[PDB]
């Protein structure tokens, strides 16, 4: 909401370090957050009438942004479903939706993940951006165990104006991203 | 009803509900309730956030289990990947390793069947 616990932290606790850290000149020039994406393949638009909207009202139930129903671009014999419509669910988070999300994720989510011993440190690489996956979806607060017929993993991709990994690394690190280190 | 590692049991007494955990046998479950003075017979569907919390307290730190124990044991079994400990050279070839009759039975450590012909 224009401001959050993490947003502040970034501005008055991370902003400083990085500069002092890599020594940036211009204000802008220092790592900021562009957007964090969270999609789901599902691949379950098969027979039995693949509603799987529950996964849409949910994906967004924990995000606050109804997702965008992506479809198959080509068409594959090998694993049924092809040519069009079928599967695909994905929402793009920016600004405040971006912050009020990462918070929970970093504070309440990542925490309870079967074993979770930090976040694999290689998922950066050349990417002034980062990527990571989740098996469950109940790892979040806004949703409980009872209500969720089936499971639902998902990919989370954070984009950064960072050019290097160190730049990206440090940032997500000063923010609160745990790390398999 | 998520306990150590969000593993969720329910609607029946805790005593057995705890069992529904990889690292909690009927024993470690009966020795876990008296150590927090709760009523065994109570249905998991009712118990102070405290009863549950201090319960998820013990459990988790009292002993290492599922996830961490689960995974861990596999590694236990790994180590027997030395140079040739006869207790490992049975683990490599899915066969019992505690000296069980092999001619017959010993099915549980070898999938269904393979049959083949005779003489």
């Amino acid at each position: 909401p224009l401001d959050v616990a993490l947003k502040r932290k970034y501005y008055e606790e991370v902003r400083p370090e990085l500069i002092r850290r890599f020594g940036y000149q211009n204000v802008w020039e220092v790592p900021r957050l562009e957007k964090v994406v969270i999609n789901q393949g599902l691949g379950e638009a098969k027979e039995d009438a693949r509603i799987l909207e529950k996964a849409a009202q949910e994906l967004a139930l924990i995000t606050g942004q109804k997702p965008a129903v992506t479809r198959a671009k080509k068409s594959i014999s090998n694993f049924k479903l092809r040519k069009g419509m079928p599967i695909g669910l994905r929402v793009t988070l920016r600004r405040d939706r971006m912050w009020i999300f990462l918070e929970k994720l970093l504070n309440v989510a990542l925490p309870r993940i079967r074993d979770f011993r930090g976040l694999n440190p290689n998922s950066f690489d050349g990417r002034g951006n980062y990527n990571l996956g989740l098996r469950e979806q109940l790892i979040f607060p806004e949703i409980t165990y009872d209500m969720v017929d089936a499971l639902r993993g998902m990919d989370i991709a954070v984009v950064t104006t960072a050019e290097t990994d160190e730049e990206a690394r440090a940032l997500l690190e000063l923010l609160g991203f745990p790390f398999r280190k | 009803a998520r306990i150590a590692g969000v593993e969720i049991p329910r609607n029946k007494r805790v005593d057995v509900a705890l069992t529904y955990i990889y690292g909690i046998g009927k024993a470690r479950a009966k020795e876990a309730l008296e150590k927090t003075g709760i009523n065994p017979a109570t249905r998991v569907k009712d118990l102070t956030e405290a009863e549950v919390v201090r319960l998820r307290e013990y459990v988790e730190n009292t002993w290492k289990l599922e996830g961490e124990l689960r995974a861990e044991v596999a590694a236990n079994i790994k180590r027997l990947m030395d140079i040739g400990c006869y207790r490992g050279l049975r683990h490599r070839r899915g066969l019992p390793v505690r000296g069980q009759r092999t001619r017959t039975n010993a099915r549980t450590r070898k999938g269904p069947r393979k049959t083949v012909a005779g003489k």
């Binding site: 909401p1 959050v4 616990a5 139930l61 924990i62 606050g64 009020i100 918070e103 929970k104 504070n107 309440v108 925490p111 309870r112 607060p141 806004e142 | 998520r2 969000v6 956030e49 549950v52 919390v53 998820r56 988790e60």
Partner: peptide, 30 residues
């Protein structure tokens, strides 16, 4: 809407999302 994270590991979290009635059975305490 704002919210509250009522774990068990003490530690409450005042932020935003939907339904400020959250029983986070395990915050960042492990």
């Amino acid at each position: 809407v704002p919210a509250r994270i009522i774990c068990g590991c003490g530690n409450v979290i005042e932020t935003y999302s939907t339904k400020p009635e959250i029983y986070v059975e395990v915050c960042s305490k492990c």
